[PDB]
């Protein structure tokens, strides 16, 4: 089990943040160049939001949502400061409630 950190946005909002998405693309590409295991992901309509421990987040969330997830806390701190209009939190996985931290509900 690992701790995952997240920043949850609306799909609408994240579509207005193209420079941000370019930063994430460049970060993936840089990781590959450095032979660093990818430890951050963008998850459309994340299934983790259904976990009981995330009930407060789900109650606040956009209808069509998307998370930036990482096992690197400092990366999510940056994401929050860069995007601002996101809900943040953390969870442990795999668990009964979150068997796949990267699963989409779509």
Author numbering: 1 to 106
Give sentences copied directly from the paper behind this entry.
Recently, the small monomeric protein Ycf54 was identified as a second candidate component of the MgPME–cyclase. The Ycf54 protein has been identified as a component of the MgPME–cyclase complex.
Synechocystis Ycf54 is composed of a single domain (annotated as the Ycf54 domain in PFAM), in which a central four-stranded antiparallel β-sheet (β1–β4) is flanked on one side by helices α1, α2 and α5 and by helices α3 and α4 on the other. This domain appears to be typical of the Ycf54 superfamily, with Synechocystis Ycf54 representing the most complete and highest resolution structure to date. In WT Ycf54, R82 adopts two clearly defined conformations, both of which form stabilising hydrogen bonds with neighbouring residues. In one conformation, R82 forms a water-mediated hydrogen bond with the side chain of W78, and in the other R82 forms two direct hydrogen bonds with the backbone carbonyl of F20 and the side chain of E17. On the WT Ycf54 structure, residues D39A and F40A are not particularly surface exposed, so we are unable to speculate as to how these mutations result in a reduced interaction with CycI.
